[PDB]
Every structure is written in C-alpha cells, then in structure tokens.
Amino acid sequence: HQPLIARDGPHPIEQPTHNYMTKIIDRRALNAAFSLATEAIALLTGEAL
Amino acid sequence: HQPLIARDGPHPIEQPTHNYMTKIIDRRALNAAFSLATEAIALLTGEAL
C-alpha cells in the first residue's frame, strides 16, 4: 500500500493507489559422493570371510 | 510601540512614535480523491446479495 498527502490545485487530484505482487519459488539442490572399494563390499556381506 | 531616549543639542528633539498594522489572511484549499468501482456500489447497496 501507499499513503498520500493532499495538495492544492491546479494539480490534478491524485488517487489512493495499491500494489500487488507474487514471487516465484526458485529451486536448487546439492550433491555429494560416498564411494566404496571393490573388496569393502564383500567384507560386509561375508563373501570374503 | 517604540521606547525613547533623551538627547542634548544639537540633536533634534524626538517624539514617541506608534505603529499599527493589518495583515490579510491568506487562504488555500485541499483535494483528495476516493474513487470506488462499479461492482462495489452493488455490494454495499444490496443488489448483489
């Protein structure tokens, strides 16, 4: 919204205004890795015990 | 009003003076708009209830 002040003519008579806005959500993401080895898989399983 | 001092010669003898003043009141005017809409008349009236 906007407030006003009153004046004398011959200014044209100014009106009360309004302003309306919408904003769009912008979207981002993250990344990370974890990598294992070949033999570290089997040691959790049991295939190399 | 004006106060005085007394003098000697050859300065001339001064008199008490007076002043009277009138001042015309300046005058202005203000303006501010309001404007409604077409539908909002029928909402406040009862024609769209």
TrEMBL record, chains A, B:
<protein>
    <submittedName>
        <fullName>Major capsid protein</fullName>
    </submittedName>
</protein>
